[PDB]
C-alpha cells in the first residue's frame, strides 16, 4: 500500500546514486549474501565482562522508536527512566533504552489475541518435557559402570530428512510467493507440507525463528558419547540424569517414542524383498529394484516411499546395506559377517587362493587375506579387538559380560580369519550336499562352517578346541578364558586376553560408493565382501501393518479386487492434462462425455448386473449436480463414474453400490474399498492399496497452487505471453503458455501440459541397448 509506494520511492532515491546503481546493476542477486557480511561486523572478547560493565549504565539497550510511540510507551513513568530520544550510530533508526522498560512492556504493554502457536514452534522441547513427565523414577544405587563410547542420536525425530529437502520445505511453508520450482520431494510429500502450512498460516510471527526451529525439529543430534544400558534417543536426551561413573538413577523408559519398532519393521521388509529377489536367478537385481519402487509404507499418519526412507536411515544391517547399494546410496565403511558386526581400524592385504579336502580328497578353493590387519568386533553384549596375520588369528582381547556371547564371538572371529586346521582339513560330518548350491548358488566354506556351528554346540566346542590350549600361567589367571567362557581357570585357550569393561567403539566420518553382483554380494573397490544374503536369518513369517505391496509377485489378492484396483488406477491415469480428459470436460461442463469413456466401459462388467441401471441413474445425478455448479470433490466422481455407463432405470436405492463380488462402495463415507481424507488429499486407498492421484486441478479442499504443479511444465520462453501471479495461475487453459516469476531473480515460461514420463526407464533401456 502506501508502504509499497514508500519502498518504491526509496528504491528510486537509491538508484539516483551511482555506486548503489552500479552494485544493483552488476552481477546477479547472490551478491546480496556477500554484502550481508561487510556490514555490521563487531565482536567482543569477554562479553560477560562488558555485560556487567554496560548493564551498570543508564540506557544500555537499543530499541525501535515508532513501535514505542504506537504502543504509547511513556518515559519517566514513576521517576524511573525508560529511554530518551537519541539515535544509535549503527541502526540510525533505534533509540537507547533501559532494561526496566521491558518489564513495563511485559506488565502493561500490548497483548496479542492468542499465543498457543508457540507449542508448535518448539514442539521438540515440549515433547522432551512430556516424555519426562511420563516417567516412573526408581531407587538410587551406587556402583561402577561399564560406559562404552560410541556414536549415537540424542534427538528423537520422525521423518528424518536431509538439508536439501528441508530448505525447500521451509520456503513452501512460509514464503510461497518467493518459492522456487517444485522439487520432487514436495510433489511426493504433499500432505506433510499441507500440515506444516495449516498451522503457520494467518498468524503474527517472526518467520526466521520458525525456520530455525524446524531445522532443529528435523535434525537428529549425533554425538560420540559414553553410554550404558539400552540405546534409545528417549534416554540419551537425559542420560545425564540416569547414571554416571559411580551412581545410577534407575528408571523405566521403555514405553515412549515408538522408534525402534519402525526400524525393525523396515529391516523385516528389506529381508522379505531381498529373499524374494533372490528367488530369481538372472535378474534378482532388477527384480529387487522393482519390488522397492513398487512398495510404500505408512509413518504415523503419512505414507512414504520405501526407497526414500532407506536413503535417510543409518541402520547398518546386511539387509539395508544391499538395498542402499542397489539404489546407488552411499554408506559407511562397516562390515557384517553373519550376526556379528565388524569395523577395520588399520592394516591392508589382498586376496589369496587355497584349498581344503572335505572328505578324503575333495579339493575346494577358499580364499584368505595375505597381510596383518586389526579389527573391532561387536556381538550381543560383547566386544572384542583382534588381529589377523596370514590366515591366522594373531591376538584378541575381549571386554564382554557373557560366556556364551564370548564363545560365539571368538568362534566367528576365528572363522573370519580362517584360523585353524579345519580350514586346512574339513571334518567328515560335512558333505558335498551341505557344501553349497541350494539350487545352484555356490557357498564359500566360510559360511558353511558358520551354519555348521549354528547347527550344534558341539561343533562350536570342537572349533574352540582347534585353538591352542595351555596351562594358565601365574598372574595371568584373571586374563584367561576357559572353554566354557570363564574369566579364570587352570588351563585356558591360547593367545587370549579378557577384561572387565567394553572397548571404545572407533569412529570415522567417511562414505563409500560400493556395488554388488548378480548373486547379491557387495564389493568395495576390492575383493572384500561387506554384505550378502547368507548372513541374515533363513526365513520367517510376519504380518506387516500399514504397508503397500503394489506389485503382482508381492501380492496375495485375487483377480477380482485386483481388477477393480487396476480399473480405478486407469481411471485415475485419465486424470491428466489434455482434452478428452475429465478436467477439461469439467471445465466445459460436459458431464455427458464422461459416461462414454473407455475405462468405465472396461470396469462395467464388474458391476452387479441386476441393479446396474438404478445405480447408474444415481451416479449420473450426482455428477451433474457437482459439475453444473462447480462445487465438487474429485474423490467422489472417481468413485461413482464406473456405474454411469449403463442406462438409467427405476427402483429404490438403498444407499450402497455393489459390484459383482459382494464388495460395495458408499458415496460420502470411507470404507475398506475406497477411503481418503482431507488431510492427505493426494492418495486413494482401495483394498488397503494406495494410489497417488496427480496434481493437475484443485477442488474446494486444496487451497494453493501446490495441487496444480503436476499440470504445468517449462517450455521455450515467449515474451508475447503475459506475466501473472501464482494465484491467477488456475484461470489458464490447458495447453496455453504464460510467463512467470520463480523464486528470486528468475523469470520463465510455463505451459499447462504435463509429462508423466520419467528418466529412469528412458535411460536404463537405452543403456541396455548399448551392451550388445
Amino acid at each position: 500500500m502506501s508502504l509499497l509506494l514508500t519502498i518504491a520511492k526509496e528504491y528510486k532515491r537509491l538508484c539516483q546514486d551511482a555506486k548503489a546503481a552500479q552494485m544493483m546493476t552488476v552481477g546477479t542477486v547472490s551478491n546480496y549474501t556477500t554484502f550481508k557480511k561487510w556490514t555490521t561486523s563487531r565482536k567482543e572478547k569477554n562479553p560477560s565482562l562488558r555485560m556487567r560493565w554496560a548493564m551498570s549504565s543508564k540506557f544500555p539497550i537499543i530499541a525501535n522508536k515508532r513501535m514505542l510511540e504506537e504502543a504509547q510507551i511513556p518515559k519517566e513513568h514513576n521517576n524511573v527512566a525508560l529511554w530518551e530520544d537519541t539515535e544509535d550510530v549503527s541502526k540510525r533508526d533505534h533509540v537507547l533504552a533501559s532494561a526496566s522498560c521491558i518489564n513495563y512492556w511485559n506488565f502493561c504493554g500490548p497483548c496479542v489475541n492468542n499465543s498457543e502457536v508457540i507449542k508448535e514452534v518448539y514442539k521438540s522441547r515440549f515433547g522432551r518435557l512430556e516424555r519426562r513427565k511420563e516417567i516412573m523414577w526408581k531407587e538410587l544405587r551406587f556402583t561402577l559402570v561399564d560406559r562404552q563410547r560410541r556414536r549415537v542420536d540424542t534427538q528423537p525425530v520422525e521423518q528424518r530428512l536431509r538439508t536439501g529437502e528441508i530448505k525447500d520445505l521451509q520456503m513452501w511453508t512460509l514464503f510461497e510467493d518467493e518459492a522456487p520450482l517444485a522439487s520432487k520431494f514436495i510433489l511426493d510429500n504433499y500432505g506433510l507440507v499441507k500440515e506444516m502450512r495449516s498451522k503457520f498460516a494467518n498468524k503474527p510471527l517472526n518467520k526466521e525463528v520458525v525456520a530455525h526451529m524446524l531445522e532443529k525439529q528435523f535434525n537428529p543430534e549425533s554425538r560420540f558419547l559414553p553410554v550404558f544400558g539400552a540405546i534409545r534417543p528417549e534416554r540419551m536426551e537425559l542420560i545425564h540424569a540416569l547414571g554416571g561413573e559411580t551412581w545410577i538413577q534407575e528408571a523405566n523408559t521403555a514405553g515412549i517414542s515408538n522408534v525402534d519398532q519402525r526400524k525393525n519393521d523396515i529391516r523385516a521388509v528389506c529381508r522379505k524383498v531381498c529373499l524374494a529377489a533372490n528367488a530369481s536367478i538372472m535378474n534378482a537385481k532388477s527384480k529387487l529394484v522393482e519390488y522397492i519402487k513398487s512398495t510404500s509404507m505408512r509413518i504415523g499418519e503419512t505414507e512414504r516411499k520405501l526407497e526414500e526412507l532407506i536413503l535417510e536411515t543409518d541402520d547398518v544391517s546386511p539387509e539395508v546395506t544391499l538395498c542402499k547399494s542397489a539404489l546407488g546410496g552411499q554408506l559407511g565403511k562397516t562390515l557384517s559377517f553373519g550376526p556379528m558386526l565388524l569395523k577395520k581400524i588399520s592394516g591392508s592385504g589382498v586376496k589369496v587362493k587355497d584349498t581344503v579336502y572335505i572328505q578324503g580328497v575333495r579339493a575346494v578353493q577358499f580364499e584368505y587375506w595375505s597381510e596383518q590387519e586389526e579389527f573391532y568386533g561387536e556381538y550381543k553384549s560383547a566386544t572384542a579387538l583382534f588381529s589377523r596375520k596370514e590366515r591366522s588369528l594373531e591376538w584378541i582381547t575381549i571386554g564382554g559380560g557373557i560366556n556364551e556371547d564370548r564363545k560365539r564371538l571368538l568362534a566367528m572371529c576365528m572363522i573370519f580369519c580362517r584360523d585353524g586346521d579345519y580350514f586346512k582339513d574339513a571334518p567328515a560330518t560335512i558333505t558335498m550336499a551341505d557344501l553349497s548350491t541350494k539350487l545352484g548358488r555356490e557357498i564359500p566354506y566360510q559360511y558353511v562352517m558358520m551354519n555348521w556351528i549354528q547347527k550344534s554346540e558341539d561343533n562350536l566346542e570342537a572349533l574352540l578346541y582347534s585353538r591352542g590350549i595351555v596351562e594358565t600361567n601365574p598372574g595371568k589367571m584373571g586374563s584367561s578364558m576357559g572353554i566354557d567362557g570363564s574369566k579364570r581357570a587352570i588351563k585356558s585357550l591360547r593367545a587370549v586376553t579378557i577384561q572387565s569393561g567394553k572397548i571404545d567403539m572407533p569412529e570415522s566420518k567417511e562414505k563409500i560408493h560400493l556395488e554388488l553382483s548378480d548373486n547379491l554380494e557387495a564389493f568395495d573397490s576390492s575383493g572384500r565382501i561387506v554384505a550378502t544374503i547368507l548372513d541374515l536369518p533363513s526365513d520367517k513369517k510376519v504380518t506387516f501393518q500399514d504397508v503397500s505391496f503394489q506389485h503382482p509377485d508381492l501380492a496375495v489378492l485375487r483377480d477380482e479386487k485386483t481388477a477393480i484396483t487396476k480399473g480405478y488406477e486407469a481411471l485415475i491415469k485419465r486424470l491428466g492434462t489434455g482434452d478428452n480428459d475429465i478436467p477439461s470436460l469439467i471445465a466445459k461442463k460436459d458431464y455427458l462425455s464422461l459416461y462414454n469413456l473407455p475405462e468405465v466401459k472396461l470396469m462395467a462388467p464388474l458391476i452387479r448386473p441386476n441393479r446396474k441401471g438404478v445405480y447408474s441413474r444415481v451416479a449420473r445425478k450426482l455428477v451433474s449436480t457437482q459439475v453444473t455448479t462447480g462445487h465438487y470433490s474429485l474423490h467422489e466422481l472417481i468413485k461413482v463414474l464406473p456405474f454411469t455407463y449403463f442406462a438409467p432405470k427405476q427402483g429404490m436405492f438403498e444407499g450402497r453400490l455393489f459390484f459383482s463380488n459382494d464388495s460395495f462402495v458408499e458415496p460420502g463415507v470411507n470404507n475398506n474399498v475406497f477411503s481418503w481424507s482431507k488431510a492427505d488429499s493426494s492418495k486413494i486407498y482401495c483394498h488397503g492399496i494406495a494410489i497417488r492421484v496427480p496434481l493437475v486441478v484443485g477442488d474446494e479442499h486444496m487451497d494453493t497452487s501446490l495441487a496444480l504443479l503436476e499440470g504445468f511444465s517449462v517450455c521455450e520462453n515467449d515474451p508475447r505471453a503475459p506475466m501473472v501471479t501464482r494465484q491467477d495461475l488456475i484461470d489458464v487453459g490447458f495447453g496455453q503458455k504464460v510467463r512467470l516469476f520463480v523464486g528470486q531473480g528468475s523469470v520463465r515460461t510455463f505451459k499447462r501440459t504435463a509429462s508423466q514420463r520419467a528418466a529412469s526407464s528412458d535411460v536404463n533401456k537405452n543403456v541396455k541397448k548399448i551392451k550388445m
Binding site: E654, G655, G668, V669
Partner: protein
C-alpha cells in the same frame, strides 16, 4: 471405550480422552435409511478389580 459426546471436566476426571476421526449415525428418512456423520471420541481409563 467409544463415545460421541465430548466430556466435562468434573464428572470425567479419571478419564484420558482423545479424538479419533469420525463415524456415522443412521436414522430413518421416509421409507429409507440415511447416514449423518458425526465426530468420535475415545475414553481411556485404568482401574482394578478382584474375584
Amino acid at each position: 471405550e467409544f463415545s460421541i459426546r465430548e466430556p466435562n471436566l468434573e464428572k470425567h476426571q479419571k478419564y484420558t480422552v482423545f479424538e479419533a476421526g469420525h463415524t456415522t449415525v443412521r436414522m430413518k428418512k421416509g421409507e429409507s435409511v440415511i447416514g449423518r456423520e458425526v465426530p468420535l471420541y475415545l475414553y481411556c481409563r485404568t482401574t482394578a478389580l478382584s474375584k
